[PDB]
Write a protein that binds this ligand. Structure first.
Ligand SMILES: C/C(O)=C1/C=C(CO[C@@H]2O[C@@H](C)[C@@H](O)[C@@H](O)[C@@H]2O)ON1
Ligand SMILES: C/C(O)=C1/C=C(CO[C@@H]2O[C@@H](C)[C@@H](O)[C@@H](O)[C@@H]2O)ON1
Ligand SMILES: C/C(O)=C1/C=C(CO[C@@H]2O[C@@H](C)[C@@H](O)[C@@H](O)[C@@H]2O)ON1
Ligand SMILES: C[C@@H]1O[C@@H](O)[C@@H](O)[C@H](O)[C@@H]1O
Ligand SMILES: [Ca+2]
Ligand SMILES: [Ca+2]
Ligand SMILES: [Ca+2]
Ligand SMILES: [Ca+2]
Ligand SMILES: [Ca+2]
Ligand SMILES: [Ca+2]
Ligand SMILES: [Ca+2]
Ligand SMILES: [Ca+2]
Lengths: 114, 114, 114, 114
């Protein structure tokens, strides 16, 4: 199944934050309407924040997260959770190797803001 | 129901990260086995990452998040999600006012790390 | 925070199914647009399905679950989960007593159907 | 990533319930410790409960859901969500064709019971 693709309400600000947990340098690309809108890159085995940003979901509301390590695409896992019918989290884990901890880059998208 | 309380794997490092979205200054306390282990604070209506820290869940694994504004406790919402039977997120929203957006402080706990 | 309230896409069919795990008879009311659209009732300590039905979310998409036992509303917990950006679960637990297992009536709403 | 595999607490009763939404007859097999413990089959495009049963997670706690149509495995998606640190849902969707609604068989596992 496709992973890392989310439909947000149109024209809505959202936060995107990435953490790293791997020996490999993580490159996280955030697409809005199929065009790159943010890119973060960093290396940590201690959950360091490698980027955070606020983006707008635009007319389509389509947001996609991609993760790669030295050009090799990571396998993704994802889901969306909504609390009290208001607060949204779109969550992504990724695997760059063999251990299947799926934390090598972790990406959190949250909305609404403000 | 009780919210903002999570049983983590014992003795395990986790990330805890807080975001602010309110005119009120947020204070987030993170308790491990009923003792304050981290405190974050700030004021943003644009999702500022007011704190991020790596903690150990300790012998019992009990982690609790509390949020206050002006010394008054915010109302909390929470859940835990697990992806591919291994990647964990404990999620908290909080409300300091009347609009019920529940984003006034948002807290994300993630494990495993490394 | 309010629990058991979900905004579905408008005019969309959804499944609603209730399970019982309590000494007490559970009555589950499913509201669409703030009117009771279905009622289930039964008693089980073995997770019996006490009702299942397909409903339409109607023009507003507002769906609410309420649970009563022994003449008093049960305390509710809830969340919505979306898998692969397609498959939606709106989940409700409820507590009629003191043990806080929150399974006394469990309600699962799923969409889309077909 | 692997989907449809969950680790439950050992020796614990759980509910498993399957719904169908496809022109194809769904076969749902629920494995405990790698051996089939329940099986449900049926065709519906109206979310019929093609089966619901109480199982015990046994010594290993390992539960896996498999879905197929006339022997051909469906593609699975899954996640687990925990409410108020106690109430557990393990969720599975599946796709037997090309439209990616992932509702062709929907399986919900819930615990604790009683
Ligand atoms: C092909 C490629 O890039 C790798 C990198 C690793 C080491 O493994 C990576 O770093 C370790 C310190 C762990 O965080 C592990 O989860 C991660 O996958 O294995 N394969
Ligand atoms: C106690 C205290 O400081 C407040 C501030 C507000 C205004 O409301 C707060 O700020 C607004 C800009 C919104 O983000 C709103 O969701 C938030 O609840 O109400 N109470
Ligand atoms: C292998 C087999 O039997 C099928 C049936 C379909 C048609 O598609 C199936 O039925 C339709 C009515 C929709 O519910 C669709 O989501 C489902 O995938 O595709 N493959
Ligand atoms: C048999 C018992 O019945 C009621 O007391 C429930 O609140 C308990 O959770 C338990 O199911
Ligand atoms: Ca890894
Ligand atoms: Ca890792
Ligand atoms: Ca607010
Ligand atoms: Ca706010
Ligand atoms: Ca109870
Ligand atoms: Ca009970
Ligand atoms: Ca399908
Ligand atoms: Ca279908």
């Amino acid at each position: 199944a496709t992973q890392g693709v989310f439909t947000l309400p149109a024209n809505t600000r959202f936060g995107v934050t990435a953490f790293a947990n791997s020996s490999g340098t993580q490159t996280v690309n955030v697409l809005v309407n199929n065009e790159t809108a943010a890119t973060f890159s960093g290396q940590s085995t201690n959950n360091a924040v490698i980027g955070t940003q606020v983006l707008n979901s635009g007319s389509s509301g389509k947001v996609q997260v991609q993760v790669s390590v030295n050009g090799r695409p990571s396998d993704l896992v994802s889901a969306q959770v909504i609390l009290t019918n208001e607060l949204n989290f779109a969550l992504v884990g990724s695997e760059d190797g063999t251990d299947n901890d799926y934390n090598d880059a972790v990406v959190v998208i949250n909305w609404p803001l403000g």
